[PDB]
Amino acid sequence: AMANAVIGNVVTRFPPEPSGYLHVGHAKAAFLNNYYAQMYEGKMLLRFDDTNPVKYEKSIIEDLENLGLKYEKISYSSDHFDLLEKYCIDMIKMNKAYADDTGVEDMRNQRGEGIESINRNNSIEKNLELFNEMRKGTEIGQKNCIRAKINMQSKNKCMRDPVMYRCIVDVPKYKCYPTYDFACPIIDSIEGVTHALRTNEDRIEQYNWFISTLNLRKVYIYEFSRLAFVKTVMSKRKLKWFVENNVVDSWVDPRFPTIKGILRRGLTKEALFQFILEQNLMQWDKLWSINKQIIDPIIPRYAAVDKNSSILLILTDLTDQVIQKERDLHMKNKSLGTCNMYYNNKYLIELEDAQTLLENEEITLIKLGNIIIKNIEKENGKIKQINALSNFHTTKKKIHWLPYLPQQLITCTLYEYDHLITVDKDWTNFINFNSKHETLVYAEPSISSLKVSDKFQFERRGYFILDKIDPHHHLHLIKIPDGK
């Protein structure tokens, strides 16, 4: 619900902290801000929330582009600190704010037991004196913070004189800083936000109090539920730990809930958006199934066999001459176009498939035709070769295959990931330090027409995305989870 939303006069804002990389939680917020702006033909601001002192701007911008989210203007919270100071003084002069030098623990306990602080009835002139000390960074100032003067006996703790301005001397222009709670309603009013979105985890009463106490233009708050996932570390400290200890070797690792990582993992922005519109810690299965049903009809198909367990199949009635036929990259989608298929008398099949055969049995080699198995050569116990006869011109065993043309077979590594932690929510006890499985395969020559980040399907094998191309023509392909 966008309260009193008017077509052409809605302004939302996405306000991420430039203190890290966007993760998928951020994605629900950035998407919903764009979704309500577009619904009402409005505007979406990008605001870097730099309220408290701590260059990720570039990464955030690039993720927001990757998600296809455009914004009308970029701002910083710090852009308005002068204005916030002015309002804080106005607050003091309406006796709506006071300087308090009570310590942290005793202030929490006073707030709990609803007892008004000693300084709550400081004069205006004294409050202004002490705020000036806060502004100049003196030890007096560092002892003081400005609180709003609301209602210490209110049933809602956020209305019990919340802190507005704090003195911060230590960490890197300004010696006092507004709090998030004070900065956020004022900046939203002055930037022209009409509908401010945020997580439902209330501060709504206090935010409204700040706006009306200062007679600013009203701003509506819409709450949404935070999106977080099982078995997913999103604490920035622990992500740092992963990187620093060489568990992953970068912040874009496909096991990281970061936006870059997940796209690298194979997720479409469409799948994420659709999951959000259709949707505590959520389960990944619904998201990857939505992704699969989005990408399956519009990606090519290719074949691959295990490079070393594959068995040599020989059609003994054919010659070594290489026949090549055109085929469709997608059997039920002619737009994706054609590839070239190559065949000979010699083929590669999976040992999984080879050890299921027996003499005088008909099977199909997919996209080629049926063959009749005649014998199985086994040396040392394991299957050495399969001899069959061509019958290309009834069967339940349709298997994939590759031509045994080693100088054209493209060599690939398949990376299959699992979750970095093992429980859903000393934590390092539950790290799967072994969540990156590699398998080497041969694939079809035509797969060389694929470019980086192209998505595709390996027949009877699953879904993959081309992450990188190696020297001497080797591909690195990430398996995309499919839900089932």
- Breaks in the chain follow which residues, C to N over 2.5 Å? 54, 172, 201, 279, 393, 425
Among 180, 224, 241, 284, binds Cl ion (CB under 5 A): 224
Piece of 232-240, 329-337, 384-392, 437-445 that binds Cl ion (CB under 5 A): 232-240
**Can residue 205 be called a binding residue for Co ion (CB under 5 A)?**
no
Q: Which stretch binds Cl ion (CB under 5 A): 161-169, 223-231, 367-375, 416-424?
A: 223-231
Mention every residue, 6+ apart, whose C-beta is less than 8 A from residue 236.
19, 20
In angstroms, rounded to a whole number, what is the distance separating the alpha carbons of residues 447 and 183?
A: 54
Q: Is 17 annotated as a binding residue?
A: yes
Set 73, 217, 226, 468: catalytic member: 226
The span of 19-27, 212-220, 337-345, 470-478 binding Co ion (CB under 5 A) equals 470-478
Whether residue 84 is annotated as binding a ligand: the answer is: no
Measured in residues, the chain has a length of 484
| Catalytic residue flag (residue 108) | no
Secondary structure (3-state) at 208? helix
Using the rule CB under 5 A, is 246 a contact of Cl ion?
no
229 binds Cl ion (CB under 5 A): no
**Rounded least distance, CB 41 to Co ion, Å:** 6
467 close to 476: Cβ distance less than 8 angstroms: yes
The strand pairing partners of 479, in sequence order, are 464
Does residue 29 contact residue 63 with C-beta atoms inside 8 Å?
A: no
* Residue 249 touching Co ion (CB under 5 A): no
437 annotated to a ligand binding site: yes
Which residue's beta carbon is nearest to the bound Cl ion?
235
Active site residue 226: yes
DSSP reduced 3-state for 120: helix
Q: Which does 18 bind (CB under 5 to 8 A by kind): Co ion, Cl ion, none?
A: Co ion
Instruction: Give which of 156, 196, 149, 164 is closest to 11, Cα–Cα.
Output: 196
Phi, psi of 282 (to 5 degrees): -80, 165
d(CA 75, CA 120): 35
Which residue is at the shortest CB distance from Co ion? 474
419 annotated as belonging to a binding site for a ligand = no
Task: State the binding string over 35-74 for Co ion (x if CB under 5 A, else -).
Answer: --------------------x-------------------
Residue 276, both tokens: 């959000």
For residue 476, say whether it is annotated as part of any ligand binding site.
no
Q: Which amino acid is at 341?
A: M
Q: Is 438 annotated as a binding residue?
A: no
Q: Distance between CA 165 and CA 169 in Å, rounded?
A: 13
CA distances from 216 to 65, 212, 435 (A): 33, 6, 53
Taking CB under 5 A as the criterion, the residue among 4, 66, 109, 225 binding Cl ion is 225
State in angstroms the smallest separation of the CB of 49 from Cl ion: 21
Q: What is the smallest separation between the CB atom of 283 and Co ion, expressed in angstroms?
A: 8
Please identify which of the residues 73, 108, 217, 236 carries the catalytic annotation: 236
Q: By CB under 5 A, is residue 470 in contact with Co ion?
A: yes
**Could you please report the per-residue DSSP string of 380-430?**
TTEEEEEEEEEE----S-EE--EES-TTTSEEEEEEEE--SBSS---GGGG
Cβ nearer to Cl ion, comparing 9 with 225: 225
Q: Which does 470 bind (CB under 5 to 8 A by kind): Co ion, Cl ion, none?
A: Co ion
Least Cα distance to 256 among 6, 24, 8 occurs for 24
Comparing CB distances to Co ion, the nearer of 186 and 412 is: 412
- Return the ∠ at Cα 147 (arms to 182 and 116), rounded to 5°: 140
Is 161 annotated to bind a ligand? Reply is no
| Catalytic residue check, 17 | yes
Give the Cβ contact number of residue 306 at 10 Å: 18
Pairing mode, strands 369-379 and 361-365: antiparallel
Q: Which of 235, 335, 380, 434 binds Cl ion (CB under 5 A)?
A: 235
Catalytic residue among 17, 116, 129, 416: 17
Q: How far is the CB of 277 from Cl ion (least distance, A)?
A: 10
Which of 418, 423, 424, 430 is the binder for Co ion (CB under 5 A)? 418
Q: Which 2-31 residues touch Co ion, going by CB under 5 A?
A: 18
Coil vs helix vs strand at 358: coil
Q: Is 265 labeled as ligand-binding?
A: no
- Please, what sign has the CA dihedral across residues 55, 60, 66, 71? negative
468 binding Co ion? (CB under 5 A): no
CB of 173 to Cl ion, least distance (A): 33
**Which residues are known binding-site members?**
17, 26, 57, 199, 226-227, 393, 418, 437
Catalytic residues: 17, 226, 236
**Which residues are known binding-site members for ADP?**
17, 26, 199, 226-227
Q: Which residues of this protein are in contact with Co ion, per CB under 5 A?
A: 18, 55, 418, 470, 474
Q: Which residues of this protein are in contact with Cl ion, per CB under 5 A?
A: 224-225, 233, 235
**Which residues are known binding-site members for Mn(2+)?**
57, 393, 418, 437
**Which residues are known binding-site members for ATP?**
17, 26, 227
